[PDB]
């Protein structure tokens, strides 16, 4: 259910062109060690919030987590584990943090509840989202 005409921001084609000959889709290779997926080249979707074929820049820290929920449109919930040291008792305690992350459509049939993902930091994207998925690691059986 699109409302404007689909076209990447930056490229400009010509009206009476051919379906095989018209401009090429522009893609990237992300924060140095992350290559774009292959469903990013051979697919049609317009996402201004996509890291590879989109308009967002990833300048910030990278973190890891575990997928806990997939129920909103292009938004997952990731849990990150960490630990705090007590001085009086000389021991640690386990703790967690919750993130809302943008999942571009190029990861459609790949990530499932229970995987591990690598996320990057961006500018504010909505009220609660300020990060994006860059890669993943499927759980071992």
């Amino acid at each position: 259910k699109l409302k404007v005409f689909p076209r990447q921001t930056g490229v400009c084609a010509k009206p009476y062109a051919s379906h095989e000959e018209q401009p090429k889709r522009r893609v990237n290779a992300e924060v140095c060690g992350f290559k774009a997926p292959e469903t990013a080249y051979t697919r049609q979707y317009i996402d201004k919030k996509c890291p590879f074929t989109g308009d967002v820049n990833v300048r910030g820290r990278l973190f890891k987590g575990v997928v806990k929920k997939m129920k909103a449109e292009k938004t997952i919930v990731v849990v990150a584990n960490y630990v705090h040291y007590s001085k009086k008792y000389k021991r640690y305690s386990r703790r967690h943090t919750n993130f809302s992350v943008h999942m571009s459509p190029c990861f459609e049939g790949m990530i499932n509840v229970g995987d591990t993902v690598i996320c990057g930091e961006t500018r504010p994207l909505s009220k609660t989202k300020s990060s994006v998925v860059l890669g993943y690691i499927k759980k071992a059986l």
Partner: protein
């Protein structure tokens, strides 16, 4: 007035807000300007730093570009036929960005005669009634002008299914 702070919203967990500050002129906003058609009227406003915006209240004579030839002409604005967000903005003839307008076809009389009545026959049928369709890509409330391009082929068919 309008103010763009978020100190008054509920929290991510649903908790009621706590305010400990008055509003700041830092984050002050304006009411929406509603650019209509007819008898140009633009106003200069003084903004932060001493700078200047131009707030169009009424406009004629867009500045459109025929894409297949790459030439700008200045046409006349006739009426609005589609807005992607609110169709109560079409009943009022309000000119925001990315609204589709019906334009006058005379000034493009040289350009349109390099296309046949072959694959684009819907562009040549409306030209004989006296009008073409265009689309606006500037922000009339921020820069004080309308500026876009003419619809042909893929675009003109995608939007034509919207406003019938």
């Amino acid at each position: 007035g309008i103010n763009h702070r978020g100190d008054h919203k509920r929290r991510k967990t649903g908790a009621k807000a706590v305010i400990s500050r008055k509003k700041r002129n830092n984050r002050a906003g304006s009411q929406p300007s509603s650019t209509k058609i007819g008898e140009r009227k633009v106003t200069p406003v003084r903004v932060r730093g001493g700078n200047r915006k131009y707030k169009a209240l009424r406009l004629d004579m867009g500045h459109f570009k025929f894409i297949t030839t790459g030439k700008f002409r200045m046409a006349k604005l006739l009426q609005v036929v589609y807005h992607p967000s609110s169709n109560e903005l079409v009943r009022t003839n309000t000119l925001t960005k990315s609204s589709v307008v019906k334009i006058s076809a005379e000034p493009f009389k040289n350009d349109i005669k390099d296309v046949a009545r072959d694959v684009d026959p819907s562009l040549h049928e409306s030209f004989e009634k006296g009008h073409l369709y265009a689309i606006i890509t500037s922000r009339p409330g921020q820069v004080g002008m309308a500026q876009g391009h003419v619809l042909q082929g893929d675009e003109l068919k995608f939007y034509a299914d919207k406003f019938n």
